[PDB]
Amino acid sequence: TQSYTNSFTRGVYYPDKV
Amino acid sequence: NFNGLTGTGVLTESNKKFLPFQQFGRDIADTTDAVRDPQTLEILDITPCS
Predict the structure, then answer these.
(1) What DSSP element (H or E) covers B35?
(2) Which top-rank group of organisms is this from (chain B)?
């Protein structure tokens, strides 16, 4: 069910249009 | 002026790979070096005037 993996590189996006 | 971004220079039509979410381009020195046409998709490099 609800396990817990770490967020390796998960968690970055693009805050720009540059 | 294209989409509120004013300036002065010479356009030279580059083939810079702008992605769909990219409308402006800034160089290593945080200086504008390329832009997209708000109407068409041509990528024009803003080169400096004489």
Answers:
(1) strand B32-36
(2) Viruses
